[PDB]
Specification:
homotetramer; alpha/beta; Aldehyde Dehydrogenase, Chain A, domain 2; six-stranded mixed beta sheet; 15 helices; 23 strands; globular; oxidoreductase
Amino acid sequence: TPKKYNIFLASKPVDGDRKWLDVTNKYTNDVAAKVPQATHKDIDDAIDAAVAAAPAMAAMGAYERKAVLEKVVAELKNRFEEIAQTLTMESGKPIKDARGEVTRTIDTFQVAAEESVRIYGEHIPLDISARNKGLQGIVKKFPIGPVSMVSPWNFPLNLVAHKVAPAIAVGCPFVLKPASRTPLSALILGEILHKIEELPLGAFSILPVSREDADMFTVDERFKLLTFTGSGPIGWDMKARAGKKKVVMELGGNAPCIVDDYVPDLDYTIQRLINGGFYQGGQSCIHMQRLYVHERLYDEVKEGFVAAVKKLKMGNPFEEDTYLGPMISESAAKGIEDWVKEAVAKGGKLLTGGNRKGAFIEPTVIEDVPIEANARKEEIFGPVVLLYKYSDFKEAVKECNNTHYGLQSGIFTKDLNKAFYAFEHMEVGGVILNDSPALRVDSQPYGGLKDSGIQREGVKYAMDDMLETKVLVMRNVGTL
Amino acid sequence: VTPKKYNIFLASKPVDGDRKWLDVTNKYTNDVAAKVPQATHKDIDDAIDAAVAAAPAMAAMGAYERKAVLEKVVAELKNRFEEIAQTLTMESGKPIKDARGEVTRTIDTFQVAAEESVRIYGEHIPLDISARNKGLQGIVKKFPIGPVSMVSPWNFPLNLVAHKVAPAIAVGCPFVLKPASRTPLSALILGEILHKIEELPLGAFSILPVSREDADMFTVDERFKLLTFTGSGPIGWDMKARAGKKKVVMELGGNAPCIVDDYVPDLDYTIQRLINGGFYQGGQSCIHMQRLYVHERLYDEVKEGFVAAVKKLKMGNPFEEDTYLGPMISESAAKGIEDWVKEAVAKGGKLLTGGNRKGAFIEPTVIEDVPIEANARKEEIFGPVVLLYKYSDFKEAVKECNNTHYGLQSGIFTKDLNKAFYAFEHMEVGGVILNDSPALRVDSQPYGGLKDSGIQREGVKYAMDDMLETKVLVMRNVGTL
Amino acid sequence: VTPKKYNIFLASKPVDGDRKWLDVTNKYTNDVAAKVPQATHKDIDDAIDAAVAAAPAMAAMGAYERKAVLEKVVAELKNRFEEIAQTLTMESGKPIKDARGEVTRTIDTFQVAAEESVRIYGEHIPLDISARNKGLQGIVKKFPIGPVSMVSPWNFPLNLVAHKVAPAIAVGCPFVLKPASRTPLSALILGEILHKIEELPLGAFSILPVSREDADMFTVDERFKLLTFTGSGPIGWDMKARAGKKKVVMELGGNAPCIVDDYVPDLDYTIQRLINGGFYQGGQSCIHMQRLYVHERLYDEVKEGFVAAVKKLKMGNPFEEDTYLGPMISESAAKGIEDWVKEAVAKGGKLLTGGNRKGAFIEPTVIEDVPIEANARKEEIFGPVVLLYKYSDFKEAVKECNNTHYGLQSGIFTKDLNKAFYAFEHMEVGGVILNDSPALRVDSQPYGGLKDSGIQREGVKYAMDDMLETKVLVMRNVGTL
Amino acid sequence: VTPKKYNIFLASKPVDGDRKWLDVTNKYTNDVAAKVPQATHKDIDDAIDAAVAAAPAMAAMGAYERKAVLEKVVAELKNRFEEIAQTLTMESGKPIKDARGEVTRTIDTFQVAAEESVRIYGEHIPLDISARNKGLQGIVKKFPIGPVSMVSPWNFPLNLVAHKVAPAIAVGCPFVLKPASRTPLSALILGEILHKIEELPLGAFSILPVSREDADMFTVDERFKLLTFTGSGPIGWDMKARAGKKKVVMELGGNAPCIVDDYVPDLDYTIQRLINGGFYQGGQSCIHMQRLYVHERLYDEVKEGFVAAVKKLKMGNPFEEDTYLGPMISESAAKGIEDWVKEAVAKGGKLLTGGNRKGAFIEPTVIEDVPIEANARKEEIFGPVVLLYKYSDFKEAVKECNNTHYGLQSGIFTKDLNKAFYAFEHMEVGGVILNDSPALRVDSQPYGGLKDSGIQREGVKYAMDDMLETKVLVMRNVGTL
C-alpha cells in the first residue's frame, strides 16, 4: 500500500483533488508513495506568499533564525533512521550511504545555525582622499528576497539542505521544486519546518511540479535568485531564460585523480580511490571518473584497484553490507551500458564489470578510453572509472584539465611543489590533496569552473549569494 | 577645425591602417574634433584570441608587477591631468570643473587598485568540523576569472572605464574594452598609457570602438569569462539574457530620491548639497537626485531656497571655468527631456523653474507634484530635472522613495538617530547617503543597485571580487610523517 | 545545617585528602554551607607541571573535539540549572533572579565558545609586495599560547570564570584556575563537569583555592604563558608588574557614568534601565552605573521618577523570588560603603534616599552633587549607590563622564544621531552603551577598558585572541617544479 | 675630519642649543664623524607633554592626511637614497650593499603604512545571539592608544625605526623616540623629513638621543600608553617588568636554526641562501642563521660547499661595493665573539674556518659539533658564526631546533609536503621559512617571537594593532521609530 504524502503551500500541508505523483522504491520498482502535484495556481500562490513573507523574514532576530535551524537539527536527529530508510527507498543508495547523507544534512543545518548569528558587517573609512573628507561608511548585508530552489535526485536531502539551510540562516523566503523521482526527503523537511513557530507564515513552499509549469521557477520576476543543482544543459538553458534574477548553478563534472605516490600507503590509497570511483554508485557530480597513475606505480595500482573493485557487494540497498545499489532507473543503467560498449568499441580495454542487470550496472574499470568516446568526454554518472598511465606530472595536470567540466580534482603526492603546482594549475573549484576528488566538507566552498556551474555552495558561501550589500555613507556624523 | 587622428589598441598595440573612421564631436560646438579608427570583425576576433593567449602570463605576474602597472597609470594621469580634463569636457560636454573632478577620481580609482593588487588575501580554514571530517584543513585562494568583456558608458568616459580596467589589472585579468562611440577618447588615452607599460604582457588589453554590426561579440563570445557593462537598463538586461555561460556585472540607471527631514548642519549647506544632487553632471548620472521629498514643516523654506539657487546656476560653454551646467550629450537627448517635462506639466505637474530647451541645452528644471502616470516620475530622466514633493509622515516618505522599479542610491537629511537607521534598514537601494544627497560616491565604496538598477557592485575591491574565482585546497592529514 | 564537603581539581582529578579546609558561608545567613580543601604549594607545582605536560595533547585535539567538550558543558549547565543558580545565590548573596540570569549567560558564553572553536581562521597572504620579495607567499595560522593562569572574582563566580575557561578550551590551552576563596563552589561545579568529559586530555585543567602564602605562584610562575585576571585594580596592576615574561590580560574596576539627554523610547523604559544599571547585582559590578548625568530640562522629572522607583526596590533574603537587592559580600564591604556615603554627605552631598546599613545590607542609595574630593565620586563604590548630577551642556557632560581614572563602560540616552556618534568618538571607555545604562554586556561583545580599568578584551572571540600566537610559514617559490 | 653637527627633534622642532654633545663614530675608521645634542631631563619632560597635547589633533586627522604624511616620507627617502645609505654604512659599519637594501626596505615599510592608514576597518556585529539580547547590535571601531615610547636598536638604525614610526603615523599616535646612541643619525634624518610635513600636528614627534641617567623615562613614564622596544633581551624583559600600567611590545634576540633535508631547487642556490643567512649583516641580526642542521646523507657535500663559499666572502671597508662583511659595532663586541669561539673550540667544537679577530672585525666562522655547555650554542652570538651539526632523524632535528630559550624564526629546506607542514606545526617560533634560511623577512609579514625572543608582532598592519584600542557602540533598538 503506497503512503499518501502532503505537499507544502505557504507553510501549510496541502492535498485536495491534485493529480497524484507515484514515487517508486528504486530496488523493487513498487509504488511506495503517492505525492500531490502542484497546479499553476499553487505555484502562483506560493510565490505571492513568499513575496508577502519577505518583510517578516527580514525582521526576524538572528537568534530566531538560529532557533529554526536548531529545531531542524533536533528533528533530523530524532527521525534519523526513518529519514535514512526513506532516502534509500526513493534514491536506491545503500542504507550506509543514506545514513552518511542524514549525518551530513545535520552538519549542514548545524553550520547554518552557527552562521545565522555571525552575519558581520564592516565599518569602513571613506576619507581616502581630501575630496572625501568627513566620510565614513557602515556596510551591512541584507536578504536578497524570495529564492527559487530546484534540487536534484542524487542527494535528495543534503543537496536540498545546502539551499534551504542558508536561506533560513539569512532570512530569505523560498519556493522549492524537489526532483519528481525523489521528493520525499524534501517533504520530510517540509513536515519539520511546518511545525516551527518562529518561521513566518508563507516563508516556505515545497512543490513537485509538472513539465508544463516547471518554467515558472526559472522565469518568474518575483524571485530574486534562482539556485539550481542538476543537469548542465538544463541549468545553462535556465540561466539564459532567467531574466533579471541572480543565478547560482551546481552542475555536472568529470573529476580526475592523479596518483603520483601512495599517501600514507597503498592500502589507504586503494581505499580512497575505491570510495571516489564508486561514490554513491558514481551517481555524484564529484564521482572520480578518470584515474591517472604514474608509470612506476601503474601495474601495482591497477592490480590492487581492480581486485578491490571485484570485492564490492552489489545488491539490495537496504542490506547493511551492500556497497553498490541500483541506478536511479533502468534507462539510466541502459545509457551507462551503451557508453561502456561504445568505449570498448572505440579502443577501451575492459578490466572488470561492464554488465547490466535491470537497473544495476557492475562496478566497471576501463583502460585507455579515447576522447572520441562519450564515457571519456561526458559525465558518466555511473560506477565507471577510466584508468590511464602517465610519465610526466605536468602532462597529467594538463590531461586532468582536458575537459569542459571543472568541479573538483584529486591528487596523491608526497612532493610539496607538486601539491601547490596542482592547486595553482588545476582548472577546478576544489583540489583534494591526498584523497580522491569525491571528498566534500559541508562548510567548504563547493562549485566549479567551465560547464560545472557558477558560484559556490557550502553554507557561508551560499549565504553570500542570498545577501545584498548596502552601505550607509555618513557625512560628518558625530559633529555637533 | 582639423580633427585629431587617434589610434585604437589591438593586442596592446596602436593600430590605424585601412580602417573606417568614426567621428567624435565637440559636444558644445558640434565640430568633428577627432577621427577614431573603427575595428573590423577580424580585429575583434584577433583581440579576443590575444586576450585568451595573454591570460596565463597575466595570472603569472607577481602582485608587485600588477601594482607597478597601476602606479605607472597614476603617474601618467597626473602628468597629463589638464590635457585629459580638456578632452573629457570636449567629448562629453561636461563643465571643465566636473571634468577635472573626474580625472581626480580616476587617479583615486587607479591608486585604490594599486594598493588592492598587493592585498588579495586567502583563508586558512579548519575542515574538521565533525568527527567524519577528522584530519582535514583547507587553503582558500582567489584566482583571476580570465578574459573580461568591458562595455563602458558616455556620462563618465574616464572614471567608469577606470572602475572596470583598474580592478582587472589589480587581479591579473586580460580584457577587451568597447568604449562608448560618442566618447572613446578618454579610453584611448588610457590605452596610450598602458601601451607604454613593459610589465603588462603582450595582448593583455584591447580598446576598440566598434560599429553596431560587430558590437554583439562583446555579449555572446564564449572566450570571455565575464561581461561587465555600465549603461542603459534595457540594453544591459538584454545583454545579460544573451551572454551565454559567462558571469555578468551590470551598472544601470536609477531614479534616486532624497528625504529632507532636517537641515544638516544648516539650511545653506542642505540647499547646496541638494543642488549638487539635482544637477550632478547636468543630471546625466545614474545617481542624479531626481525626486525630492521635503517634510511639510520645512517645505516652503526649502522650495524657495532650492528654486532660488537653481535660478543662479550658470548654463553655457563647458570650457568656461564658472559654467555649472553644460549641454546634454545630443539634441535628441535634450528633446526627449523637453517632451517629458511638457508631459509632466500636462498630467498635472506644476513647473517652478526652467523647462525650456536651446538646442542640446535644457534649463535646470524643478516640477512640483508630478503623478506616477508621467514618464518624468516613473522613468530615469537623465537630465537637469528635479521632482519636488511634500510629505507629512516619515515612514510614508521612505515607502514613496521605494515606490520605483530602480534601486541604486537614496539620500536622507536627518538629525534623528532612529530615522537614519530606519532609512538604512528599509530603503531598497545599494547605498543610503546620510546627510548628503544620493549623488555621492566614494571610489572605494560598494556601488551598485537593486531592482532594475543592475546586479553586483563596483568600487575597486568589490569589482575585483567579480573578477576572481574561489579555489580550495582540501588537505588530508598534511604534516603527518 | 551540615556543610557540604567539596573536592578540588588537580590535573583533571578530584582531590581531597588531609588538606586544610576552607569555610564557604551562605552570604545571607552567615552559616558555613561548604567545606573546601585548600591546595598546598606542592599541589600548585603538580598542577602547573600537568598543564605543561598536557599542552601538546591539547594542541593536537581536532576542532570538533574542542567543540564536543564545550557542547557537553552547555548540556550539563542546562541539566543542573536550578542546582547551580541556588549554589550561586548562596555563596555570592545575589538574588536568585540574578543568579538564574548568570547561569543563562554562562550557557551563552560556553555556546559562543563551542561555535568559535570550529572557526579559528588563518590567512593566506601574498608576500611579493616588491621586486626583492618576488616568489614569496605566506600562510598565517594561530596556535595555542600554552598553559594559562586564571584568577577569577567573587561578584560573578560562574560567568567571569566561563569568560576565561570557555576561550581556553575553544583554543586548546591547558589551564590552572585560582577561584576566589569567598565564592569557589561555582568554579568547582565547572570542575566536576569537565572531569567527566573524555575528549579533554589528562592534566588539561586544575581548579585550586589557594593560601595567601602561595597565591603568588599564579603571577610569577615561568611555566605559564598567559595571566588572565579579573578583580581589584591595585592587586591587578601589582600582578602585571611582577608577572615576568608572560602576557597579561586584566579586567579591573570601573566608575561608570550615564548621560540622560532624552527618554528612549519613553520615561518609564528610561527609569527602568537606569534602575537596572544603578542597582545591577546591588552595585557589586565592574560596570555598575555609579554616576548619572541628566540634562537640566529633564532633571526634576528623572530625579522624582528614579528616586520613587529606588524606594520600591525589595531588599532582603536573596533566595526569595521577588527580592531585587541582596546583601553585600561581607559586613565590612557594607561598612565601607556606609562610610563613603557618610563622607559624601559630609563633603556636601545631598542624600535623596537610603544610605543606612543593616549588617551586610546597604539600602539602595541616591546622593545628589557629590564633589570629586569625596571617595564615593573619585573611586569605585561597588555598592547600591548612584551619584546624581545635572548638566546644561552635552559636550561638558561627555568631558565629566571622562573625568575619572577608570574607563570600562559609559551609557547614553539620546534621539540625536550626532550626539550618539560624538559620545562613541569621545568617551574614554571600551564600550559605549546607546539607549541603555552602562551595566549592559553581551557575552560575545569586546569587553574591557582603558586607563585603570585594565588591559585587553574579554568576550569569547576576543579572549581567544589573547590565548593564541601568530605563526607564519614564509614560502619561497612553492609550486615551482 | 670635522664632525657634522646634527639637530635633535623636540615637539616637532629642530633643537641644538647648549646641550652636551654625543659623538657618533665611523664604525670602520673609528673617527668622530658626527656630534649630536643630547636631550636633558627637561627636554624629555617637554617632549612627553607635547605628545600628550598633540594626541587629540593626531586622532582628529583624516585617514588621507595620515596617508599624505607617509607618502611624503617615501618621496623624501627616494630623493635622499644614496645620502641615507652612506650615512647608514658610516654609523653602523654594514656594507654599502646592505645599507642600500635597508633604505629600500624602509621605503617599503613606509609605503605599506601609507596604504594601511586608509584601511583601518571596523566591524558591524549582530548582538541578538539569544532571546535575552533581542534588539541589540554593535559597531566595533579601533582608536589610537595614545602617546608611544619608542626605543630602537643599532643593527637596523633605519628600518627598525620605520617599523615603529610608520605604524604610529598610520594609526594617528604621537610618539617620543629614543634612538640607539651608537647609531642615531638614521632616526634624525627621518626627523628632518617629518619636521617639514605640514599635515603632521605640532608636538606629534620627538627624536631624542638620551644619556644613561635619563633613559629610564622611556620605561616608567605614566603619560605613555605603549612602550615598543627592539634590542637586548635582558634589557627588554627588565623594561617590561618596570613599565607600570602601559602595554609593552618587545622585539628581542634569537638563536635561529635551519634544517637542510634537501637541496631546493639545487645545491648552488641552497648554499647561497645558507651563506646569506649565516652571514646576514655579519650575523648582527636577531634572525641570523646561527645553527645549521644537515641530513647525514647530504652532510659532507653541504659542509664542503658551504665552507668553500664562506672562504670566498670579502671582509673589509664597508664603503667598498664588493665588501660582503663589514666590522662589528665595536671592538668589545668582536672581542666577545672571539672569546665565545675560543670557548666553543675548548669545549670540543671543531673550527672549520675563521675564528680570528682584527680590531672590530671577526672572520666568517664555521664551528662543527659545539656542545650545549658552550655560550656559542646556548646564547645569541650576534656575529658571523655558524654552528654546523649532522642529524639522522628529521623529528629529532625539529626537536633540536626547538632546544633553545629563544624562538624568533627557523628555516627548513625540503621537497617533502609533510615535513614542511610538520615543521610549520612543531617549530616553536613566530616564523618558519620554507626553502630559504631563517634570515628572511618581508616588511608586511607578522614578525616576532615566542619564549625569550619577545612579545607581540611587528610588520606594519600587526604593529598597528598594538597601537589601537577596541571600542564597541552597543545599540539598543536603534532604527525603531
